[PDB]
Design a binder for this molecule. Structure first.
Ligand SMILES: CO[C@@H](CCc1nc(CO)c[nH]1)c1ccccc1
Length: 305
């Protein structure tokens, strides 16, 4: 349990351009991947078995997210839309139109009655899942929005931007509750709530990750050693074994840190391009990593701790 020993189990091939994101289904069954090749692909979490392709976006996809019940996907595309997909039928249920530029990031709230989106048009939008109508448009940032995430009860949204700010929003009213990172720069490339909704993990494009106390609005911890000057790279709370922070890197490696000691406890070697996206399995010690154009594969890693 002390230090993880993640080892390569499967390499998943199929995507013909850069992979943009990977996410495990909450029920642990599936990995979903999105790509610059305009496709979503579904894989078996435990054996990497290719299950299907999902098609309909007219341009590249930047993000994909799962509903609580593992039955829906939402995707964010350069075609300026989001799409809600029934995963079982592979059919597009709704197209979410309203953004005036690339949609970069998306997530379901835990109720999975709302979707939150971030765009190059510098706004965050909230969508009704059943009707696909836009409920609210938040003038959230003054540069592209890099990440959006709901907290554990869906009462708050956290957003991040190249404008160098991290903000938190009241879901119901869409009013700003606070501006957490108010620095002019470095650009905030990623943010998400901790599983308890108490902290916020934030990446800045100066090779730095930080853990913030949302309530107190102050930085508890700092993680470094990786390379992150250009890309919006996902980061994760690993909580099934040892308590880790997980991130990709522009040196083609996956970085794992001890959350408390801030020490590098593993570096995963295999990718041949920037590791843009990592995801942690909800019940087993498994990591999915995915990489850009020169590589285009997804790797599944497994650990005893
Ligand atoms: C090169 O940038 C990636 C962006 C990946 C990403 N990070 C976040 C953080 O919330 C969202 N999405 C990408 C974009 C489009 C096609 C392929 C790759």
């Amino acid at each position: 349990g002390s230090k993880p020993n993640y080892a390569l189990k499967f390499t998943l091939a199929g995507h013909t351009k850069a992979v943009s994101s990977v996410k495990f289904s909450p029920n642990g069954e599936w990995l979903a991947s999105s790509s610059a090749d305009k496709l979503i692909k579904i894989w078996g979490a435990y054996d990497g078995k290719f299950e299907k392709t999902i098609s309909g976006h007219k341009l590249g996809i930047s993000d994909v997210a799962w509903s609580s019940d593992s039955n829906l996907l939402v995707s964010a595309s350069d075609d300026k839309t989001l799409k809600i997909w029934d995963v079982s039928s592979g059919k597009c249920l709704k197209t979410l139109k309203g953004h005036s530029n690339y949609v970069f990031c998306c997530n379901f709230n835990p109720q999975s009655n709302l979707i939150v989106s971030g765009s190059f048009d510098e706004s965050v939008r909230i969508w009704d899942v059943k009707t696909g109508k836009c409920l609210k448009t938040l003038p959230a940032h003054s540069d592209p929005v890099s990440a959006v995430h709901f907290n554990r009860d869906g009462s708050l949204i956290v957003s991040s931007s190249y404008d160098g700010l991290c903000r938190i929003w009241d879901t119901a009213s869409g009013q700003c509750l606070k501006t957490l990172i108010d620095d002019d720069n470095p650009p905030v490339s990623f943010v998400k709530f901790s599983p308890n909704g108490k902290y916020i993990l934030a990446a800045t494009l100066d090779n730095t990750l930080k853990l913030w106390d949302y309530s107190k609005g102050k930085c508890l911890k700092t993680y470094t050693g990786h390379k992150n000057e250009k890309y919006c790279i996902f980061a994760n709370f690993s909580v099934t074994g040892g308590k880790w922070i997980v991130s990709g890197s522009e040196d083609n490696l996956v970085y794992i840190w001890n959350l408390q000691t801030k020490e590098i406890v593993q570096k995963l070697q295999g990718h041949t391009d920037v590791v843009i996206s990592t995801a942690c399995h909800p019940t087993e010690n498994i990591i999915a990593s995915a990489a850009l154009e020169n590589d285009k594969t997804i790797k599944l890693w497994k650990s005893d701790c």
